[PDB]
Amino acid sequence: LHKEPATLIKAIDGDTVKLMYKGQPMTFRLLLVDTPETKVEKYGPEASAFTKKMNENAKKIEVEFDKGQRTDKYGRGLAYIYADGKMVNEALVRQGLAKVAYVYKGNNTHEQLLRKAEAQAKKEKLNIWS
16 A cells, blocks of 8 residues: 555544645545544544544644545545554554444455554553443
8 A cells, every 4th residue: 555645634523534635625534443423422522632633733644545445425535544654543543532443345454453453442441442
């Protein structure tokens, strides 16, 4: 897979962010993560603040499409997002602010990696796992 440059335009919530990709604005849905709903579920606003802060403080944001379908039915890009080289999808799961989601249309490259971050968060009874 390859990382492509992007520019943060605006946070939306825990699992979604608006990015300038290839010169055009696009909404991205983070692959393989299921955060709590805000629009509220417990930790829903925590997840949103986390994603918002991580992308905001980042010097460089990168988009990494997986090997499966690249956009969902609502026109959102399906990818792994990196903030200064750190994967937000993974950071979220590791912080116990999101559960790993069902694989979607062959986009499973990082499933095990997130799977492990999640086991650890649960082991630490962190946030959602409290």
